Amino acid sequence: LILLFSRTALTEKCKLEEDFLYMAYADIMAKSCVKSF
């Protein structure tokens, strides 16, 4: 999946699109990230 996104980003296009797949899986990958010590 990440290789797909890197492929699409490296692809010469002169304009970044929306790519609604990216703006869901990126949110998913971001939201996966005396004893108090």
Short mmCIF file of N, CA and C in Angstrom, two decimals:
data_model
loop_
_atom_site.label_atom_id
_atom_site.label_comp_id
_atom_site.label_asym_id
_atom_site.label_seq_id
_atom_site.Cartn_x
_atom_site.Cartn_y
_atom_site.Cartn_z
N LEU A 1 0.82 -1.20 0.00
CA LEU A 1 0.00 0.00 0.00
C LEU A 1 0.86 1.26 0.00
N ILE A 2 1.86 1.29 0.87
CA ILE A 2 2.73 2.45 0.94
C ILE A 2 3.55 2.59 -0.34
N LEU A 3 3.91 1.47 -0.97
CA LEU A 3 4.63 1.55 -2.23
C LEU A 3 3.74 2.09 -3.33
N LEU A 4 2.45 1.75 -3.29
CA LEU A 4 1.50 2.32 -4.24
C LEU A 4 1.43 3.83 -4.10
N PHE A 5 1.34 4.30 -2.85
CA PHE A 5 1.23 5.74 -2.63
C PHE A 5 2.51 6.46 -3.05
N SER A 6 3.66 5.86 -2.78
CA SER A 6 4.92 6.47 -3.21
C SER A 6 5.04 6.48 -4.72
N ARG A 7 4.53 5.44 -5.38
CA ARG A 7 4.51 5.41 -6.84
C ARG A 7 3.67 6.55 -7.39
N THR A 8 2.47 6.71 -6.85
CA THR A 8 1.59 7.77 -7.33
C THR A 8 2.16 9.15 -7.04
N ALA A 9 2.91 9.30 -5.95
CA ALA A 9 3.48 10.59 -5.62
C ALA A 9 4.69 10.91 -6.50
N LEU A 10 5.51 9.91 -6.81
CA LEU A 10 6.64 10.13 -7.70
C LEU A 10 6.22 10.31 -9.15
N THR A 11 5.01 9.90 -9.52
CA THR A 11 4.57 9.98 -10.90
C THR A 11 4.44 11.43 -11.33
N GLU A 12 5.16 11.79 -12.40
CA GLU A 12 5.14 13.15 -12.91
C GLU A 12 3.76 13.49 -13.43
N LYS A 13 3.12 14.46 -12.77
CA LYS A 13 1.73 14.84 -13.04
C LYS A 13 1.49 16.34 -13.08
N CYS A 14 2.41 17.17 -12.58
CA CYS A 14 2.34 18.63 -12.52
C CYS A 14 1.15 19.17 -11.71
N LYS A 15 0.47 18.32 -10.94
CA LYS A 15 -0.63 18.74 -10.09
C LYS A 15 -0.99 17.58 -9.18
N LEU A 16 -1.05 17.82 -7.88
CA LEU A 16 -1.49 16.79 -6.94
C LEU A 16 -3.01 16.73 -6.92
N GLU A 17 -3.54 15.52 -7.05
CA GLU A 17 -4.97 15.27 -7.09
C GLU A 17 -5.50 15.16 -5.66
N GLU A 18 -6.70 14.61 -5.48
CA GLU A 18 -7.27 14.38 -4.16
C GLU A 18 -6.93 12.99 -3.62
N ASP A 19 -7.34 11.94 -4.34
CA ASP A 19 -7.02 10.55 -3.99
C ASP A 19 -7.56 10.19 -2.61
N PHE A 20 -8.90 10.10 -2.56
CA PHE A 20 -9.64 9.85 -1.32
C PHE A 20 -9.21 8.60 -0.56
N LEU A 21 -8.59 7.63 -1.23
CA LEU A 21 -8.00 6.51 -0.51
C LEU A 21 -6.91 6.97 0.44
N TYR A 22 -6.10 7.94 0.01
CA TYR A 22 -4.98 8.40 0.81
C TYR A 22 -5.45 9.08 2.08
N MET A 23 -6.51 9.88 1.98
CA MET A 23 -7.01 10.65 3.10
C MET A 23 -7.92 9.87 4.03
N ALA A 24 -7.92 8.54 3.95
CA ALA A 24 -8.50 7.66 4.95
C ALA A 24 -7.45 6.75 5.56
N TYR A 25 -6.61 6.15 4.72
CA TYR A 25 -5.56 5.29 5.24
C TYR A 25 -4.48 6.09 5.95
N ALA A 26 -4.26 7.34 5.55
CA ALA A 26 -3.32 8.17 6.29
C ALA A 26 -3.85 8.49 7.68
N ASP A 27 -5.14 8.81 7.78
CA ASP A 27 -5.75 9.03 9.09
C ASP A 27 -5.70 7.77 9.93
N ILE A 28 -5.86 6.61 9.30
CA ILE A 28 -5.81 5.36 10.04
C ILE A 28 -4.40 5.10 10.54
N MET A 29 -3.40 5.31 9.68
CA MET A 29 -2.02 5.11 10.08
C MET A 29 -1.56 6.12 11.12
N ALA A 30 -2.17 7.30 11.16
CA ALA A 30 -1.81 8.29 12.16
C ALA A 30 -2.47 7.99 13.50
N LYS A 31 -3.72 7.54 13.48
CA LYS A 31 -4.42 7.17 14.70
C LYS A 31 -4.00 5.81 15.25
N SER A 32 -3.05 5.12 14.61
CA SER A 32 -2.36 3.98 15.18
C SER A 32 -1.05 4.38 15.83
N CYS A 33 -0.96 5.59 16.38
CA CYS A 33 0.24 6.07 17.05
C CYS A 33 -0.14 7.01 18.19
N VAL A 34 2.90 3.61 42.82
CA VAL A 34 4.14 4.15 42.30
C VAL A 34 4.54 3.37 41.04
N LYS A 35 3.57 3.23 40.14
CA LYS A 35 3.73 2.55 38.85
C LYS A 35 3.56 3.49 37.66
N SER A 36 3.43 4.81 37.89
CA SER A 36 3.30 5.73 36.77
C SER A 36 4.57 5.79 35.94
N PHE A 37 5.72 5.52 36.55
CA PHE A 37 6.98 5.48 35.81
C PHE A 37 6.97 4.35 34.79
#
